[PDB]
Amino acid sequence: KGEMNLNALFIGDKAENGQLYKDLLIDLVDEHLGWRQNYMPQDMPVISSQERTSKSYEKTVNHMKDVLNEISSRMRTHSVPWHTAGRYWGHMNSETLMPSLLAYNFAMLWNGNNVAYESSPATSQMEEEVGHEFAHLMSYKNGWGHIVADGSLANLEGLWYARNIKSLPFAMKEVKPELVAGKSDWELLNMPTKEIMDLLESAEDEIDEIKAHSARSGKHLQAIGKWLVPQTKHYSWLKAADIIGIGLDQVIPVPVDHNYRMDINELEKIVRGLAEEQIPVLGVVGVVGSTEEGAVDSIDKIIALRDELMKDGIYYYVHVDAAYGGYGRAIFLDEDNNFIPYEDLQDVHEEYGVFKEKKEHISREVYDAYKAIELAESVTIDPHKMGYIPYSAGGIVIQDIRMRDVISYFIPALLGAYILEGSKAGATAASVWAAHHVLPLNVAGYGKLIGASIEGSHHFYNFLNDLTFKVGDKEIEVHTLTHPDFNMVDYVFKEKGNDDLVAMNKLNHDVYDYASYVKGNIYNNEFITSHTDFAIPDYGNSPLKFVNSLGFSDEEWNRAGKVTVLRAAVMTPYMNDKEEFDVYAPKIQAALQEKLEQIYD
Amino acid sequence: KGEMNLNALFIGDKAENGQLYKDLLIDLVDEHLGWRQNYMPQDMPVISSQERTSKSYEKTVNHMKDVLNEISSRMRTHSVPWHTAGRYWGHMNSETLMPSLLAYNFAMLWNGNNVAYESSPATSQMEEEVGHEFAHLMSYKNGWGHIVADGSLANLEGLWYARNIKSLPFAMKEVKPELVAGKSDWELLNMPTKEIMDLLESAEDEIDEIKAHSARSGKHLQAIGKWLVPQTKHYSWLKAADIIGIGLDQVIPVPVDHNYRMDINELEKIVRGLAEEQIPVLGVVGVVGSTEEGAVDSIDKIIALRDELMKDGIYYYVHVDAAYGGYGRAIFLDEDNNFIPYEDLQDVHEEYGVFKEKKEHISREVYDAYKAIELAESVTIDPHKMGYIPYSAGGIVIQDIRMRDVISYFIPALLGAYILEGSKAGATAASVWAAHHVLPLNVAGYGKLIGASIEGSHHFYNFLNDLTFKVGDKEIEVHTLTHPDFNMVDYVFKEKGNDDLVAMNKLNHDVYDYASYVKGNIYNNEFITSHTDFAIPDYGNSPLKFVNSLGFSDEEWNRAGKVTVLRAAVMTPYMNDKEEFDVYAPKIQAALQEKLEQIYD
């Protein structure tokens, strides 16, 4: 209390806490078995002693052992060794929290289903508490949330909310016109969500008929307008628009700037233009922790722009895709759940051990973005990402608990009444609940874990920016894409002098191949990273500033049509201390020297 | 080999195999830890010895232990003790298979994500093999499948398929009209799925443009027609129609008969009527294992009706909702995966130990229903139900692997390209794969487990049909709803003489309350069951035959408006032997005598 040791919370890079994990696991299994035996203890075991020493029992057990050895063989041949402390620099995956692993294995022995309270009252209560913890993480005063199978489905459910909510004024006009007396059709299509919810709550006995005339009926799906997303995340959201019925043509990409954040001037232009056409805006998606560059969209500027457009009768729903970055908000919350003032941030981070070196680590712009999430209608958040909880565990949070009435079907007696999916594991809720209660969602818990990831990524960034290699007669240099908004560092290797961009992309594709399962056995790979392509169809000219900085030309940029970037989502918590990072600094350099020499020689 | 012992495959009613579970679990954890340590063995552990004996480490571990004790306390106070052999007779939940539990805990230590092959090559391969095992379970010759977060989402994905598939002829008319030359709009809306797929495969270079004009665009959602579902399952499917964009008004309930199977004469009437209106049929849902009565719809008659309607230019997609009953199909497959001829069924079941007493256990009608699943376009199947796999694990199977191109977004390099959801646990695939390879999906594996469940349910049915109790001066009798199509037995208690149906519903609601978490502590409950209401808005007059058989009147039936039924999904594998069932026969009677006496006295 007053500080917590992250090294006790993971199995470990080298299984240093393996015995601790095993002792706690067997202790938990024993408590489950003891509970099982003392339900109706007067019943004698149905599986007899003689049965358990029979040959048919032994042959079945042997067949089980053979299947499990085959699973062990396959897992140990091919799986990715991202548990390592300072050799894996790629996808959004490190170790998961031991209390979550333990709570999952324990809860799974009961095999409860959280879709109905009767199936598992304890895990249902834990999901409710997890929902309120999500809402408090977003500083929602009367919000709610729940666990979703993954972040893709949470985004879908966010779109489901916006779709139904937008359609509700038309539904009220048709069912109880007194609610929306004297409002033009355009006004109906630009009512703020809070006002819609207030009206719907007034019509208590008519909510069902009103809901029957909303978008749930299949009516007005094209009248509700366009879904605006960052350009770099346009393709992924096509799927959700496809599913929810508005269709691919209703998704509009908003260009990003040279930091891969949505350009808010371009957003204003698209929104005001659409308003001039009397085409409503169904909603806008701001991304907190982008998948391919870890960018944090300026949520504060998205919300303030909305405040200015409401003076001109224009409103849009805001959904925050914080799948990756959402647990990051805990680093700003003190122990009373108050957002720490920016001026005080470095002081509280020193006192809580959040950051080891007292300097600026979080820009005021990222700070302001995270603070304004409180004003968005809904937020996608992934416990299986920055929550360090095992797959599969997404989340969605809604600003106003009343909003769930707009999608409901009749503590929830049937949590399935309020959610997009159906059956779901109570073990998943136990696993999230356990993490949240070992680590509070503020600077005293998750703040310290997020801080260790961010600080490790900053050491990696500084190391790469001072990196030059000699291979044959050639000299290869490393360049970082941008100062990380969160904990993801993107970078490229480039032959000093070579101005062929197609060639640099070949080089960086060669480094990925030799630093992935593509070339060699993964268990013998001394440095592993991930890769992605920034292509003009998805990125526009947002990478042009960076490509120019490296010496390439506008014409080069258009001939290649893309830049191939290496990607490190630094989730390891062990690289926050410079001395620990310095042990792995020469090991990385040496591992890259021999990768580069294989590429040329 | 040639017979397998189910008692070795579960932790056990009384934790009889607890030590076996623990030995195998720790063995698996050790293999994982050993794999972890021998990635880069030249690296020294980052978490030092001194760190592990420090006070800050110990205080964090103690805080973890406190959280886990709180989870243990909550789980053991409230969770449902359905692991018991012969005292739990309610919801679709018993023990899950030990090899699946073990494989999940093992695979979760790697924490792979199956949405992309690079994240976890081994678990991705296992999901592919699981997909082909699903397809072979349905006798599909060139089908495919995958694991879905749950059965609700699998049904949604089935609707997504039908929606997009129905819309594709219009899309081809607009993009490559030569494909559908001379076809009227009604013909386009009644093309068989195989013909649509054949055409789309011919237009290899135009598939993308064709897909861009399908229902993915948001266009033609009302032109594709009506989704027909059994009446008793109308409300649940409202949700999927809502989400997918066709809307609530496009779902038409088809009445069920007095066995709660979809009335195929009523289906013909609704379909021919709609065809006369030139309103297409988007698809028909046949339910194999219904949620509230375990009914098996006559899939063979649904498909044969479709064959007859295609002579008149009427076609409909068939989706089989086998969430509950799908693993049941293994009981008909021999070891070469050939459907066993009905005449031979009792012979093969005796030889494989599927059934202990050689008599008719499966009617020819259920047999014929399961056999015709091979002709449906898609099937929802839940490993977390009759697969005895832990939550959360659904499944969907498609008849023709080519169909997945109609929903795709670009062994799968990205399985996420072919599925509705996004991120998903490789551990789930390992857990399903382990069950499928310990127990083949035929009579040599799952057939024996399904058989034990069915035979146990038949002993329960026969016991309840001979049950009479004396309480005070009153006499209470038990009546079963119907001969079970699968392993679910529904029943009611009735005061002999009392013709007040509202009163009988009160009685059976009182028995449920005293046989659930409602009244008392669940860990002290000696008999547990579930309940549901058959109400006229959802069931029509389908229960009238049964209500009349008990002595109630048509007017009584309409005054009460419903009948309240107790429900036993007999999933326990331990009650297949009469002698074992006879140990629990008097314990149930005694437990019910004291429940009935509390109700009256």
PDB file of C-alpha atoms in Angstrom, chain B residues 308-529:
ATOM      1  CA  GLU B 308     -40.495 -29.466 -54.402  1.00  0.00           C
ATOM      2  CA  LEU B 309     -40.671 -25.650 -54.342  1.00  0.00           C
ATOM      3  CA  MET B 310     -37.665 -25.318 -56.677  1.00  0.00           C
ATOM      4  CA  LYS B 311     -39.766 -26.996 -59.368  1.00  0.00           C
ATOM      5  CA  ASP B 312     -42.057 -23.917 -59.033  1.00  0.00           C
ATOM      6  CA  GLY B 313     -39.158 -21.426 -59.017  1.00  0.00           C
ATOM      7  CA  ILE B 314     -39.057 -20.943 -55.222  1.00  0.00           C
ATOM      8  CA  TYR B 315     -35.809 -21.337 -53.268  1.00  0.00           C
ATOM      9  CA  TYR B 316     -34.781 -20.609 -49.696  1.00  0.00           C
ATOM     10  CA  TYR B 317     -31.452 -20.756 -47.859  1.00  0.00           C
ATOM     11  CA  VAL B 318     -31.532 -23.229 -44.959  1.00  0.00           C
ATOM     12  CA  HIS B 319     -29.566 -22.473 -41.767  1.00  0.00           C
ATOM     13  CA  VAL B 320     -29.579 -25.198 -39.110  1.00  0.00           C
ATOM     14  CA  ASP B 321     -29.502 -23.890 -35.528  1.00  0.00           C
ATOM     15  CA  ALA B 322     -27.871 -26.928 -33.946  1.00  0.00           C
ATOM     16  CA  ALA B 323     -26.273 -24.916 -31.117  1.00  0.00           C
ATOM     17  CA  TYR B 324     -27.471 -27.516 -28.612  1.00  0.00           C
ATOM     18  CA  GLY B 325     -27.909 -30.664 -30.680  1.00  0.00           C
ATOM     19  CA  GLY B 326     -25.052 -30.427 -33.194  1.00  0.00           C
ATOM     20  CA  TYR B 327     -22.513 -32.665 -31.435  1.00  0.00           C
ATOM     21  CA  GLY B 328     -25.375 -35.156 -31.327  1.00  0.00           C
ATOM     22  CA  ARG B 329     -24.789 -35.948 -34.985  1.00  0.00           C
ATOM     23  CA  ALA B 330     -21.635 -37.921 -34.072  1.00  0.00           C
ATOM     24  CA  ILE B 331     -23.836 -40.683 -32.673  1.00  0.00           C
ATOM     25  CA  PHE B 332     -24.834 -41.576 -36.258  1.00  0.00           C
ATOM     26  CA  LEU B 333     -21.352 -41.648 -37.830  1.00  0.00           C
ATOM     27  CA  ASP B 334     -19.202 -44.765 -38.049  1.00  0.00           C
ATOM     28  CA  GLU B 335     -15.419 -44.684 -37.942  1.00  0.00           C
ATOM     29  CA  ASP B 336     -15.099 -44.044 -41.684  1.00  0.00           C
ATOM     30  CA  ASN B 337     -17.458 -41.064 -41.173  1.00  0.00           C
ATOM     31  CA  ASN B 338     -20.398 -42.754 -42.945  1.00  0.00           C
ATOM     32  CA  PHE B 339     -23.914 -42.224 -41.610  1.00  0.00           C
ATOM     33  CA  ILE B 340     -25.009 -45.529 -40.030  1.00  0.00           C
ATOM     34  CA  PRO B 341     -28.122 -47.027 -41.749  1.00  0.00           C
ATOM     35  CA  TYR B 342     -31.118 -46.771 -39.432  1.00  0.00           C
ATOM     36  CA  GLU B 343     -31.730 -50.539 -39.511  1.00  0.00           C
ATOM     37  CA  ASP B 344     -28.154 -51.054 -38.260  1.00  0.00           C
ATOM     38  CA  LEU B 345     -28.268 -48.326 -35.607  1.00  0.00           C
ATOM     39  CA  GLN B 346     -29.022 -50.452 -32.503  1.00  0.00           C
ATOM     40  CA  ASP B 347     -26.376 -53.019 -33.591  1.00  0.00           C
ATOM     41  CA  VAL B 348     -23.554 -50.431 -33.921  1.00  0.00           C
ATOM     42  CA  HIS B 349     -24.649 -48.706 -30.689  1.00  0.00           C
ATOM     43  CA  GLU B 350     -24.433 -52.043 -28.792  1.00  0.00           C
ATOM     44  CA  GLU B 351     -20.978 -52.831 -30.272  1.00  0.00           C
ATOM     45  CA  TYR B 352     -19.613 -49.336 -29.456  1.00  0.00           C
ATOM     46  CA  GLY B 353     -21.136 -49.224 -25.974  1.00  0.00           C
ATOM     47  CA  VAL B 354     -23.108 -46.160 -27.056  1.00  0.00           C
ATOM     48  CA  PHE B 355     -26.238 -47.510 -25.372  1.00  0.00           C
ATOM     49  CA  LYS B 356     -26.284 -50.046 -22.550  1.00  0.00           C
ATOM     50  CA  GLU B 357     -29.783 -51.493 -23.167  1.00  0.00           C
ATOM     51  CA  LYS B 358     -30.499 -52.609 -26.740  1.00  0.00           C
ATOM     52  CA  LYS B 359     -33.826 -50.932 -27.633  1.00  0.00           C
ATOM     53  CA  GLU B 360     -35.028 -48.054 -29.768  1.00  0.00           C
ATOM     54  CA  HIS B 361     -33.512 -44.860 -28.387  1.00  0.00           C
ATOM     55  CA  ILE B 362     -33.578 -42.592 -31.464  1.00  0.00           C
ATOM     56  CA  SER B 363     -36.684 -42.364 -33.643  1.00  0.00           C
ATOM     57  CA  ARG B 364     -36.410 -42.631 -37.416  1.00  0.00           C
ATOM     58  CA  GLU B 365     -37.674 -39.020 -37.608  1.00  0.00           C
ATOM     59  CA  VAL B 366     -34.814 -37.647 -35.478  1.00  0.00           C
ATOM     60  CA  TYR B 367     -32.422 -39.852 -37.468  1.00  0.00           C
ATOM     61  CA  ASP B 368     -33.755 -38.435 -40.735  1.00  0.00           C
ATOM     62  CA  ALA B 369     -33.554 -34.874 -39.404  1.00  0.00           C
ATOM     63  CA  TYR B 370     -29.893 -35.212 -38.446  1.00  0.00           C
ATOM     64  CA  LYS B 371     -29.025 -36.909 -41.739  1.00  0.00           C
ATOM     65  CA  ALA B 372     -30.452 -34.049 -43.830  1.00  0.00           C
ATOM     66  CA  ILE B 373     -28.260 -31.414 -42.112  1.00  0.00           C
ATOM     67  CA  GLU B 374     -25.756 -32.344 -44.813  1.00  0.00           C
ATOM     68  CA  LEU B 375     -27.954 -30.475 -47.325  1.00  0.00           C
ATOM     69  CA  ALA B 376     -28.286 -27.195 -45.446  1.00  0.00           C
ATOM     70  CA  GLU B 377     -26.135 -24.234 -46.418  1.00  0.00           C
ATOM     71  CA  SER B 378     -24.862 -23.543 -42.883  1.00  0.00           C
ATOM     72  CA  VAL B 379     -25.072 -24.915 -39.325  1.00  0.00           C
ATOM     73  CA  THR B 380     -24.541 -23.266 -35.939  1.00  0.00           C
ATOM     74  CA  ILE B 381     -22.895 -25.750 -33.465  1.00  0.00           C
ATOM     75  CA  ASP B 382     -21.841 -25.068 -29.846  1.00  0.00           C
ATOM     76  CA  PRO B 383     -18.787 -26.877 -28.417  1.00  0.00           C
ATOM     77  CA  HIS B 384     -19.750 -25.195 -25.083  1.00  0.00           C
ATOM     78  CA  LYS B 385     -23.012 -27.165 -25.116  1.00  0.00           C
ATOM     79  CA  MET B 386     -23.013 -30.854 -26.223  1.00  0.00           C
ATOM     80  CA  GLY B 387     -19.314 -30.697 -26.973  1.00  0.00           C
ATOM     81  CA  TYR B 388     -18.700 -30.534 -23.160  1.00  0.00           C
ATOM     82  CA  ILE B 389     -16.095 -27.811 -23.789  1.00  0.00           C
ATOM     83  CA  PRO B 390     -15.788 -24.883 -21.342  1.00  0.00           C
ATOM     84  CA  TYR B 391     -17.323 -21.510 -22.103  1.00  0.00           C
ATOM     85  CA  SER B 392     -16.892 -19.658 -24.316  1.00  0.00           C
ATOM     86  CA  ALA B 393     -16.876 -21.697 -27.556  1.00  0.00           C
ATOM     87  CA  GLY B 394     -19.437 -21.595 -30.348  1.00  0.00           C
ATOM     88  CA  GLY B 395     -19.105 -22.752 -33.918  1.00  0.00           C
ATOM     89  CA  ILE B 396     -20.413 -22.293 -37.414  1.00  0.00           C
ATOM     90  CA  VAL B 397     -20.093 -24.670 -40.368  1.00  0.00           C
ATOM     91  CA  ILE B 398     -20.660 -23.806 -44.031  1.00  0.00           C
ATOM     92  CA  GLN B 399     -21.587 -26.373 -46.701  1.00  0.00           C
ATOM     93  CA  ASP B 400     -19.324 -24.888 -49.365  1.00  0.00           C
ATOM     94  CA  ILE B 401     -15.964 -23.371 -48.417  1.00  0.00           C
ATOM     95  CA  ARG B 402     -16.379 -20.944 -51.349  1.00  0.00           C
ATOM     96  CA  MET B 403     -19.276 -19.256 -49.528  1.00  0.00           C
ATOM     97  CA  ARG B 404     -16.777 -17.525 -47.214  1.00  0.00           C
ATOM     98  CA  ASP B 405     -15.683 -15.315 -50.126  1.00  0.00           C
ATOM     99  CA  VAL B 406     -19.055 -13.545 -49.919  1.00  0.00           C
ATOM    100  CA  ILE B 407     -18.254 -12.065 -46.473  1.00  0.00           C
ATOM    101  CA  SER B 408     -14.459 -11.908 -46.646  1.00  0.00           C
ATOM    102  CA  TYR B 409     -12.279  -8.809 -46.224  1.00  0.00           C
ATOM    103  CA  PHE B 410      -8.714  -8.582 -47.608  1.00  0.00           C
ATOM    104  CA  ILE B 411      -5.232 -22.029 -44.203  1.00  0.00           C
ATOM    105  CA  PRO B 412      -6.090 -18.342 -43.763  1.00  0.00           C
ATOM    106  CA  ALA B 413      -3.090 -16.101 -43.356  1.00  0.00           C
ATOM    107  CA  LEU B 414      -5.629 -13.916 -41.498  1.00  0.00           C
ATOM    108  CA  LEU B 415      -8.511 -16.088 -40.263  1.00  0.00           C
ATOM    109  CA  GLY B 416      -9.965 -12.727 -39.355  1.00  0.00           C
ATOM    110  CA  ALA B 417     -10.476 -12.225 -43.090  1.00  0.00           C
ATOM    111  CA  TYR B 418     -13.269 -14.841 -43.102  1.00  0.00           C
ATOM    112  CA  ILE B 419     -15.178 -14.298 -39.854  1.00  0.00           C
ATOM    113  CA  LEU B 420     -17.579 -11.881 -38.218  1.00  0.00           C
ATOM    114  CA  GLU B 421     -15.572 -11.235 -35.016  1.00  0.00           C
ATOM    115  CA  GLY B 422     -11.973 -10.119 -34.606  1.00  0.00           C
ATOM    116  CA  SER B 423      -9.474 -11.171 -31.917  1.00  0.00           C
ATOM    117  CA  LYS B 424      -9.989 -14.632 -30.432  1.00  0.00           C
ATOM    118  CA  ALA B 425      -8.049 -16.894 -28.071  1.00  0.00           C
ATOM    119  CA  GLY B 426      -5.839 -19.584 -29.551  1.00  0.00           C
ATOM    120  CA  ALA B 427      -6.483 -21.330 -26.236  1.00  0.00           C
ATOM    121  CA  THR B 428     -10.117 -21.844 -27.291  1.00  0.00           C
ATOM    122  CA  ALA B 429      -9.029 -23.702 -30.437  1.00  0.00           C
ATOM    123  CA  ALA B 430      -6.578 -25.822 -28.420  1.00  0.00           C
ATOM    124  CA  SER B 431      -9.398 -26.682 -26.039  1.00  0.00           C
ATOM    125  CA  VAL B 432     -11.778 -27.720 -28.835  1.00  0.00           C
ATOM    126  CA  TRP B 433      -9.037 -29.526 -30.772  1.00  0.00           C
ATOM    127  CA  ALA B 434      -8.075 -31.495 -27.635  1.00  0.00           C
ATOM    128  CA  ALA B 435     -11.656 -32.698 -27.112  1.00  0.00           C
ATOM    129  CA  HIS B 436     -11.991 -33.707 -30.765  1.00  0.00           C
ATOM    130  CA  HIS B 437      -8.793 -35.740 -30.702  1.00  0.00           C
ATOM    131  CA  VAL B 438      -9.453 -37.490 -27.371  1.00  0.00           C
ATOM    132  CA  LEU B 439     -13.047 -38.136 -28.581  1.00  0.00           C
ATOM    133  CA  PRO B 440     -13.589 -38.559 -32.353  1.00  0.00           C
ATOM    134  CA  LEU B 441     -16.815 -37.082 -33.708  1.00  0.00           C
ATOM    135  CA  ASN B 442     -18.365 -40.490 -34.388  1.00  0.00           C
ATOM    136  CA  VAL B 443     -19.645 -43.473 -32.416  1.00  0.00           C
ATOM    137  CA  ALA B 444     -16.130 -44.358 -31.188  1.00  0.00           C
ATOM    138  CA  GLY B 445     -15.831 -41.015 -29.348  1.00  0.00           C
ATOM    139  CA  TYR B 446     -18.536 -38.397 -28.881  1.00  0.00           C
ATOM    140  CA  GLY B 447     -21.187 -40.952 -29.896  1.00  0.00           C
ATOM    141  CA  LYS B 448     -20.600 -42.759 -26.629  1.00  0.00           C
ATOM    142  CA  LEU B 449     -20.851 -39.543 -24.558  1.00  0.00           C
ATOM    143  CA  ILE B 450     -24.026 -38.386 -26.360  1.00  0.00           C
ATOM    144  CA  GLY B 451     -25.473 -41.872 -25.871  1.00  0.00           C
ATOM    145  CA  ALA B 452     -24.857 -41.770 -22.120  1.00  0.00           C
ATOM    146  CA  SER B 453     -26.665 -38.407 -21.846  1.00  0.00           C
ATOM    147  CA  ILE B 454     -29.633 -39.601 -23.926  1.00  0.00           C
ATOM    148  CA  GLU B 455     -29.948 -42.872 -21.986  1.00  0.00           C
ATOM    149  CA  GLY B 456     -29.774 -41.023 -18.680  1.00  0.00           C
ATOM    150  CA  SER B 457     -32.537 -38.697 -19.856  1.00  0.00           C
ATOM    151  CA  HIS B 458     -34.672 -41.718 -20.796  1.00  0.00           C
ATOM    152  CA  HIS B 459     -34.281 -43.184 -17.298  1.00  0.00           C
ATOM    153  CA  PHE B 460     -35.337 -39.817 -15.869  1.00  0.00           C
ATOM    154  CA  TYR B 461     -38.338 -39.637 -18.183  1.00  0.00           C
ATOM    155  CA  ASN B 462     -39.536 -43.156 -17.210  1.00  0.00           C
ATOM    156  CA  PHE B 463     -39.008 -42.376 -13.494  1.00  0.00           C
ATOM    157  CA  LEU B 464     -41.076 -39.159 -13.634  1.00  0.00           C
ATOM    158  CA  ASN B 465     -43.915 -40.842 -15.575  1.00  0.00           C
ATOM    159  CA  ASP B 466     -44.361 -43.284 -12.656  1.00  0.00           C
ATOM    160  CA  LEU B 467     -44.215 -40.614  -9.935  1.00  0.00           C
ATOM    161  CA  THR B 468     -46.942 -39.823  -7.370  1.00  0.00           C
ATOM    162  CA  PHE B 469     -46.527 -38.092  -3.969  1.00  0.00           C
ATOM    163  CA  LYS B 470     -48.747 -37.754  -0.853  1.00  0.00           C
ATOM    164  CA  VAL B 471     -48.493 -34.382   0.925  1.00  0.00           C
ATOM    165  CA  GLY B 472     -50.991 -33.580   3.657  1.00  0.00           C
ATOM    166  CA  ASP B 473     -54.289 -34.867   2.325  1.00  0.00           C
ATOM    167  CA  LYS B 474     -53.419 -33.694  -1.203  1.00  0.00           C
ATOM    168  CA  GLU B 475     -51.904 -35.928  -3.887  1.00  0.00           C
ATOM    169  CA  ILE B 476     -49.424 -34.363  -6.340  1.00  0.00           C
ATOM    170  CA  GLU B 477     -48.611 -36.112  -9.617  1.00  0.00           C
ATOM    171  CA  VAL B 478     -45.941 -35.561 -12.269  1.00  0.00           C
ATOM    172  CA  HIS B 479     -46.514 -35.420 -16.017  1.00  0.00           C
ATOM    173  CA  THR B 480     -43.962 -35.194 -18.770  1.00  0.00           C
ATOM    174  CA  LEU B 481     -44.431 -32.757 -21.608  1.00  0.00           C
ATOM    175  CA  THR B 482     -43.427 -35.009 -24.506  1.00  0.00           C
ATOM    176  CA  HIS B 483     -41.186 -37.924 -25.381  1.00  0.00           C
ATOM    177  CA  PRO B 484     -37.745 -36.262 -25.644  1.00  0.00           C
ATOM    178  CA  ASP B 485     -36.347 -35.871 -29.160  1.00  0.00           C
ATOM    179  CA  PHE B 486     -32.856 -35.521 -27.636  1.00  0.00           C
ATOM    180  CA  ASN B 487     -31.780 -35.406 -23.969  1.00  0.00           C
ATOM    181  CA  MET B 488     -34.112 -32.772 -22.510  1.00  0.00           C
ATOM    182  CA  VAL B 489     -37.090 -33.797 -20.378  1.00  0.00           C
ATOM    183  CA  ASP B 490     -39.785 -31.263 -19.522  1.00  0.00           C
ATOM    184  CA  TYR B 491     -42.343 -31.927 -16.825  1.00  0.00           C
ATOM    185  CA  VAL B 492     -44.917 -30.404 -14.475  1.00  0.00           C
ATOM    186  CA  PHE B 493     -46.260 -31.255 -11.010  1.00  0.00           C
ATOM    187  CA  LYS B 494     -50.070 -31.139 -10.692  1.00  0.00           C
ATOM    188  CA  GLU B 495     -52.537 -31.538  -7.821  1.00  0.00           C
ATOM    189  CA  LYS B 496     -54.817 -34.431  -8.911  1.00  0.00           C
ATOM    190  CA  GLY B 497     -58.285 -32.842  -9.176  1.00  0.00           C
ATOM    191  CA  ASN B 498     -57.273 -29.168  -9.186  1.00  0.00           C
ATOM    192  CA  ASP B 499     -58.356 -27.913 -12.651  1.00  0.00           C
ATOM    193  CA  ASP B 500     -57.103 -24.350 -11.985  1.00  0.00           C
ATOM    194  CA  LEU B 501     -54.236 -23.959 -14.453  1.00  0.00           C
ATOM    195  CA  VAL B 502     -53.156 -20.678 -12.853  1.00  0.00           C
ATOM    196  CA  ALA B 503     -52.737 -22.730  -9.661  1.00  0.00           C
ATOM    197  CA  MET B 504     -50.648 -25.475 -11.288  1.00  0.00           C
ATOM    198  CA  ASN B 505     -48.379 -22.767 -12.714  1.00  0.00           C
ATOM    199  CA  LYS B 506     -48.109 -21.374  -9.184  1.00  0.00           C
ATOM    200  CA  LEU B 507     -47.225 -24.843  -7.886  1.00  0.00           C
ATOM    201  CA  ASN B 508     -44.527 -25.458 -10.487  1.00  0.00           C
ATOM    202  CA  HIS B 509     -43.182 -21.951  -9.979  1.00  0.00           C
ATOM    203  CA  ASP B 510     -43.005 -22.802  -6.255  1.00  0.00           C
ATOM    204  CA  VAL B 511     -41.063 -25.993  -6.964  1.00  0.00           C
ATOM    205  CA  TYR B 512     -38.584 -24.070  -9.106  1.00  0.00           C
ATOM    206  CA  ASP B 513     -38.128 -21.396  -6.421  1.00  0.00           C
ATOM    207  CA  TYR B 514     -37.384 -24.081  -3.834  1.00  0.00           C
ATOM    208  CA  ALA B 515     -35.102 -25.846  -6.383  1.00  0.00           C
ATOM    209  CA  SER B 516     -32.992 -22.863  -7.410  1.00  0.00           C
ATOM    210  CA  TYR B 517     -31.010 -20.018  -5.865  1.00  0.00           C
ATOM    211  CA  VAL B 518     -34.345 -18.262  -5.184  1.00  0.00           C
ATOM    212  CA  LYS B 519     -35.127 -19.886  -1.808  1.00  0.00           C
ATOM    213  CA  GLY B 520     -32.191 -21.033   0.342  1.00  0.00           C
ATOM    214  CA  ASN B 521     -28.482 -21.548  -0.120  1.00  0.00           C
ATOM    215  CA  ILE B 522     -27.715 -23.400  -3.408  1.00  0.00           C
ATOM    216  CA  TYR B 523     -24.933 -25.494  -1.757  1.00  0.00           C
ATOM    217  CA  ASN B 524     -27.549 -27.051   0.579  1.00  0.00           C
ATOM    218  CA  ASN B 525     -30.126 -27.648  -2.202  1.00  0.00           C
ATOM    219  CA  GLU B 526     -30.803 -31.423  -2.627  1.00  0.00           C
ATOM    220  CA  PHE B 527     -32.527 -31.143  -6.054  1.00  0.00           C
ATOM    221  CA  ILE B 528     -32.072 -28.391  -8.629  1.00  0.00           C
ATOM    222  CA  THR B 529     -34.066 -27.830 -11.807  1.00  0.00           C
TER     223      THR B 529
END
